[PDB]
Structure formats: structure tokens, C-alpha cells
Design a protein around this ligand. Sequence first.
Ligand code: HEM
Ligand SMILES: COc1ccccc1O
Ligand SMILES: COc1ccccc1O
Length: 293
Amino acid sequence: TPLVHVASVEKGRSYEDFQKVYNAIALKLREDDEYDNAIGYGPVLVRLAWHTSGTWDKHDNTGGSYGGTYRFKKEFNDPSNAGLQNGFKFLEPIHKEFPWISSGDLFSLGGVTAVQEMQGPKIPWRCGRVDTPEDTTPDNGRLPDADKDADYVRTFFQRLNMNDREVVALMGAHALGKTHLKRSGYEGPWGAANNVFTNEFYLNLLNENWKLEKNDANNEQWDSKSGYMMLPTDYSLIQDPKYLSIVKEYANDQDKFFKDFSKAFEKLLENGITFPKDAPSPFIFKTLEEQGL
Ligand code: HEM
Ligand SMILES: COc1ccccc1O
Ligand SMILES: COc1ccccc1O
């Protein structure tokens, strides 16, 4: 008997309230611009949204974004979550200013805000995640290993109810940020921009000259002469013929990648949540730039 998690709108809140939270996150992203050699907190916030959602299991509705369970020791100490404390620390003053927003709503909204502020697609977002108790925290080990092949990636993502297109689209988030040796045992950025959301991940996969090397942690990763890297799981997207077709598609159509990423990312963030028939429609937040702020 899977759990049922029903979205419940924070009492009396509407679009304007959530746009204010978005704005606070966005303003702080602009302000705190030295973090991680001037990449800023955008990428780590996207990773935090993904890891807080990616614990979901479709079979029994355990894990997922709803409960905001990353706030609990077992989950924030997950080896898979190493470094995400930076995203959590970033969000702390946001939580303090807006203590009415649920933890799940805040983690997921952090990811949406980061993507949009980094010039990515609009990501419609729905409120109503409700904090669940410590004993609802999923055990460690539900997040994916990076040292694996296409078969692993495909099978892994079936648990999150993602198909090939959704997987390939979601992986394009690797345009953002970088791997850090001390966090994950991998080192280097996937591309040049780091804090601009584009289809660069796919272009780099297809266009760079990759060499399978060992990093300083004795793990294999694919390295280019440009100083970029790909995880074995990234590289598997061009080894598998079905993934490869989709990589080529996104490398050659920026708009299509944006549309597909937006759908898959919202889906990821909403997995496991039952929205009542009379729940508000998804919100689409204006960027700071769109507001002249
Ligand atoms: C097979 C699936 C995936 C694997 C194995 C994987 C693995 C990793 C690893 C090892 C890192 C480096 C962590 C570090 O050293 O800081 C990383 C970073 C990152 N991941 Fe993925 N990931 C996967 C899918 C995703 C998805 C679906 C998203 C979001 C849509 C995502 C977003 C990010 C972002 C933005 C970073 C950079 C974080 C930063 O710069 O602080 N990843 N991932
Ligand atoms: C300076 O870093 C950022 C600014 C706005 C959005 C995301 C970032 O990483
Ligand atoms: C419950 O406190 C938090 C939740 C989500 C993000 C930052 C926080 O301080």
C-alpha cells in the first residue's frame, strides 16, 4: 500500500507570496557570487532539488520531494549528498525570512529559481509539499552511482518513472557547475559556462575529443583537451544507440531541449504528490530580469 501524499497549499498563500520567495532566492544568488570559484550557488541548488526529489520510489511512494526529509541527519549525511550542505546553508536565510514555506517547497523552488536565473527554461512549479517526520526519511543508497553504464542509467531511472527522452533531457543539467574530487571522487567541469543553462552538455559530448583517464581519486572519467570531463554515466549517453539519437537531437535544437527539460524537471519535482482537482494551477515565476529587479 503506497503512501498517499496530498498537496496542501500553505495557508492563505498565492502566486505573489511564492514570487517573493523566488525573488529572495534570486537576489541572494546574485549577491553570493564568490562561492565555488565564482560559479555561485545556482548549480548546487539544482543538484539539491534533484537529490531531494530523486530518492522517490514509484513502487511504494517512499522518498520524493514532498516530505522535505533532507533536513534530517540520515539524508543530509548521505554520502551521495556530499557538498549539498552548501545549498542548504544558502537556503537558511530564505527559510528564516519565509518560515511559512514548507521544506519540500523550498528545496524544489530553489532548483526552479536557479535554472531560471541562469537563463534556463521556465519551469512551472506547484506549491503544497508538507513536512513529514524524521522516520519518513528514506535510507541512503537511492541516488545513482556515476561509475556505471547505459543499462544501469536506464534501469535506475525506471524507478523515477523516467523514459529515455526524460533521462537524456534531465542529464543536460550537467551543463551546470562541476564535479569536486573531495565530494564525489570526480574532478572537473562538463563545460565552459558553469552558471549559464544551455545545451552545452550535449554539444560537448559530441564535439570534444574524449580520453578515458584516471583522476586523482583513482576513478575513471572521460577528459577532453579543453579541460572538460564526463562521468562514465554521462559518456554512456553516446555509447547507447537510443540515448545517442536523443543527445544529437538536443545538441541541434536548443528550444526542444529547453521544452523537454522543463517538463522532465517539473515531473521529477512533483513525483509522488497528489494534487487535488481544485489545487491552484502551476505557477510560472518571472525572473529578476523580467521584473526589472
Ligand atoms: C545517472 C544520473 C546522475 C549521476 C550518476 C550524477 C552524478 C553527479 C556527480 C558525481 C556530481 C558531482 C558532485 C560533486 O563532486 O560536486 C554531480 C553534480 C551535479 N549534478 Fe548530477 N548526476 C546525475 C543526474 C543529474 C540530474 C538528473 C540532475 C538535475 C536535473 C543533476 C544535476 C547536477 C548538477 C547541477 C551538478 C553540479 C553541482 C555543483 O556544481 O555543485 N545530475 N552529479
Ligand atoms: C553568480 O552566480 C550566480 C548568479 C545567478 C544565478 C546562479 C548563479 O550561480
Ligand atoms: C527547515 O529549515 C530549512 C528548510 C529548507 C531549507 C533551509 C532551511 O533552513
